[PDB]
Known about the structure:
The structure is cut from a larger assembly and holds two copies of chain A.
Chain A: no helix or strand
Amino acid sequence: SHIDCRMSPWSEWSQCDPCLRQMFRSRSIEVFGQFNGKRCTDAVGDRRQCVPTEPCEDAEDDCGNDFQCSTGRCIKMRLRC
Amino acid sequence: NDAPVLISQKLSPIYNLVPVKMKNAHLKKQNLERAIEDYINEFSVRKCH
């Protein structure tokens, strides 16, 4: 039996993420295909650039404790030289 | 060991590999998705005799 893949349930566009600058057109997987028919490896997910509307005031501070590293981590007490 | 070859291959669609925040990345993403769907469902043993 040449079972096809019913694998295109589309969803509605969600709100744009201002800080990440991405959209969330959604999808889902329903049918694989048990027999030698059409193989369907279509991955779930879709992205899109979007003009941000929020100021994106949320940000990660440099732990407010000690010397900041070049990547984002911090010295606790003795991570010096 | 000098020259190996593939045995098992885990698969992933190409339209997920397109770089984000490009000129028209999202529309090109869904466009290539429709293209690969039309490719995989266009010509095969299913359509032949």
